[PDB]
């Protein structure tokens, strides 16, 4: 029994928590990502990258702290603590926004470690690892939003800053500039998420309300109830639960493809026939046109301060208004 | 075998293909009316003076729109909360011009939804099972009543109600965000947590069952309860915002010691809301 | 010489309805963009 | 609009549909 077998058995030994080989990648990376976020919110400010006060020392609130993204001038530099930017100076590394890269990269490797961990646990117990395949969706979302999107853009500056109000800013920015709500892939994502919630709710209620007076619930009564109330019903239990698994994951993957599309400005921003028809006559007004106008307004009123590095100067005259 | 008894045994019978029941007696006509009018007014319907300013806004398929951009425009701003029945209209063309079809659809649809909840309870009773599917269904019901009924009531006119269309929904969302800052309202955060967590728990439960099937009752109870509670909360949040009780506001919070103001993310969010609002509000 | 590995392909009615619903719903969603 | 928009929509509607119907028919004919 070489050192390797001893190490393997030691990893697989029962404890309060299971480590496994995956733990060697998951736990340090997850812990570092969490610590990076906590430090960035508690002490480091974004006064030099976004000109904001996003730390507790600054006096911010829990809803306004954020590990803000690096500056725009750095492009997609990895911002290593020992790179050409930081050059080993911790303070400059923090001020330049290196905590964002620290947190995001260690988060990527934590998610990878978690998926590997689920593979390993399912291998030990001896059941199909549908949990890992389910978790594949969140990894797709994470990779699409925090890596592929800022990589398709000018800089890391356009990535979602780790926060609450910063994420809200990201949502509104996406609507203003990419018109995301009109993207069909985001529509499939929304349908997937809302359908997953619907499935969870009605499945729970049905199982509770067809309980036997002692699996454990009257599948026959549930089937008849839904057939005569709604029209259709699951007559198979395995299909029912695989569908519950399948819907939200598919929604996440569709949204992921939508987000990678808008990372290249390959966005469904407008309908050509509507633009032409509005150009021909000014009376033609639909909800889509007014959405377009709202996008123009949000772009104009947010750009001077959101992308402060660009030194945008729009006077009051050029700002769109409802006159 | 009285004729009345025979009728009752027909309706309250578990041998129809679809259960009718006494609640379904109201559900069927109202739902059929709403569906028929929605189809007709979504395919072809004149432009509607949504702003009550003699200037119309079109939303039908035959007037240029497609499925993504088409909608059924809310009733005109001049009508207010007045019911506008066809027989209470000056002329059919005018009645369309003011947006009567929207009122017809939403009222029949809301009555049908509440009767559908009742029908769910009734059939659960007729089959001999605990009658709490309707309680779970009461959450999305509350949400629809919030956007279609309660919000216009708080705002004084149905012109502020949600349009019946895919792009109309988004326009409603953006105007609502502009005027009430819903994102920073804790109840919407509860709702977001509810839907995302409901999807998470659905995926976890499905994966576990389908992986091993090759108090555990409390598991399914929690599955049923979590998203329903969160949707109740977010529907109540929308309803409160219908009475100008807006969410959190942290604009202009940190100030420099001498007296200057240092920006935070909340100020960026407020400026985005400002853009959305100034693009709204045609005049002032 | 026959191939042992041949197996038929099965699709019941319910699966047909599910597939047709998926296809028709996707077509309805994406036609508004295909026509652009 | 795109002259190929209608054709793309029609083929999208049709090809998976005929595939599924063919599979179901050659299933149901078999016992």
């Amino acid at each position: 029994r070489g050192w390797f077998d001893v190490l393997d058995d030691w990893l697989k030994r029962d404890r309060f928590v299971f480590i496994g080989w995956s733990g060697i990648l998951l736990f340090p990376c997850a812990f570092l990502s969490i610590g990076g976020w906590f430090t960035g919110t508690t002490f480091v400010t974004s006064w030099y990258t976004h000109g904001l006060a996003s730390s507790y020392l600054e006096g911010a609130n829990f809803l306004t702290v954020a590990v803000s993204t690096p500056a725009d001038s750095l492009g997609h530099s990895l911002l290593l603590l020992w790179g050409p930017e930081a050059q080993g100076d911790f303070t400059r590394w923090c001020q330049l926004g290196g905590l964002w890269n620290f947190t995001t990269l260690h988060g990527v490797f934590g998610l990878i470690g978690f998926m590997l961990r689920q593979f390993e646990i399912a291998r030990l117990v001896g059941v199909r690892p549908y949990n890992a395949v389910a978790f594949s969706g969140p990894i797709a979302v994470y990779v699409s939003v925090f890596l592929m999107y800022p990589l398709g853009q000018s800089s890391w500056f356009f990535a979602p800053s780790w926060g609450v109000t910063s994420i809200f800013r990201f949502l509104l920015f996406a609507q203003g500039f990419h018109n995301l709500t009109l993207n069909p892939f985001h529509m499939m994502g929304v349908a997937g998420i809302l359908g997953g919630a619907l499935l969870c709710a009605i499945h729970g209620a049905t199982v509770e309300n067809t309980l036997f007076e002692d699996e454990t619930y009257s599948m026959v009564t549930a089937n008849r109830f839904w057939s005569q109330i709604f029209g259709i019903a699951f007559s198979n239990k395995r299909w029912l639960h695989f569908f519950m698994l399948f819907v939200p994951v598919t929604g996440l993957w569709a949204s992921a493809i939508g987000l990678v599309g808008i990372a290249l400005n390959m966005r469904a921003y407008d309908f050509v026939s509507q633009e032409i028809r509005a150009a021909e006559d000014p009376e033609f007004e639909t909800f889509y046109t007014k959405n377009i106008l709202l996008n123009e307004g949000l772009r104009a009123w947010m750009a001077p301060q959101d992308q402060i590095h660009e030194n945008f100067i729009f006077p009051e005259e050029v700002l769109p208004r409802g006159n | 075998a009285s004729a009345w008894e025979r009728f009752c045994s027909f309706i309250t019978s578990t041998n129809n293909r679809l259960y009718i029941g006494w609640f379904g007696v109201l559900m069927i006509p109202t739902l059929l009316t709403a569906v028929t009018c929605f189809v007709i007014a979504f395919i072809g319907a004149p432009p509607v003076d949504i702003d009550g300013i003699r200037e119309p806004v079109a939303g039908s398929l035959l007037y240029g729109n497609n499925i993504i951009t088409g909608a059924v425009v809310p009733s005109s701003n001049a009508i207010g909360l007045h019911l506008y029945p066809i027989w209470e209209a000056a002329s059919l063309d005018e009645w369309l011009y003011n947006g009567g079809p929207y009122q017809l659809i939403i009222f029949h649809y809301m009555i049908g939804c509440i009767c559908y909840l009742g029908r769910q309870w009734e059939y659960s009773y007729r089959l001999g099972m605990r009658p709490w599917i309707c309680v779970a269904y009461s959450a999305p019901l509350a949400a629809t009543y919030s956007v279609f009924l309660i919000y216009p009531l708080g705002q004084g006119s149905f012109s502020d109600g949600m349009p019946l269309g895919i792009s109309g929904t988004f326009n409603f969302m953006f105007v609502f965000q502009a005027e009430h800052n819903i994102l920073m309202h804790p109840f919407h955060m509860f709702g977001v947590a509810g839907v995302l967590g409901g999807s998470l728990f659905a995926a976890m439960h499905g994966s576990l069952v389908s992986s091993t099937l090759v108090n555990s009752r409390s598991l399914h109870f929690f599955l049923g309860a979590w998203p329903v509670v969160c949707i109740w909360l977010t529907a109540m949040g929308i309803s409160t915002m219908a009475f100008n009780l807006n969410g959190f506001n942290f604009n202009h919070s940190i100030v420099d010691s001498q007296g200057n103001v240092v920006n935070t993310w909340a100020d960026v969010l407020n400026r985005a809301n400002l853009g959305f609002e100034v693009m709204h509000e045609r005049n002032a | 010489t026959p191939n042992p590995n041949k197996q038929p392909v099965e699709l019941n009615r319910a699966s047909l309805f599910i597939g047709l619903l998926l296809v028709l719903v996707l077509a309805l969603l994406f036609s508004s963009y295909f026509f652009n | 609009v795109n002259d190929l928009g209608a054709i793309a929509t029609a083929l999208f509607v049709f090809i998976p549909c005929v595939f599924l119907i063919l599979l179901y028919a050659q299933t149901a004919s078999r016992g």
Binding site: N223, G231, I232, A233, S235 | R17, L18, I43, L61, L62, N66, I67 | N12, R13, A14, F17, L20, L21, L24, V25, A27, L28, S31, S32, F35 | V1, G5, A6, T9, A10, V13
Partner: peptide, 28 residues
């Protein structure tokens, strides 16, 4: 003509609902 495409897809969906409701193979 887009209207025809939309309406045809919608009518096919409704027909699918009719057949899925009244002609499903009996669960057993």
């Amino acid at each position: 003509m887009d209207v025809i495409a939309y309406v045809f897809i919608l009518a096919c969906i409704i027909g699918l609902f009719f057949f899925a409701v009244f002609f499903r193979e009996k669960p057993t």
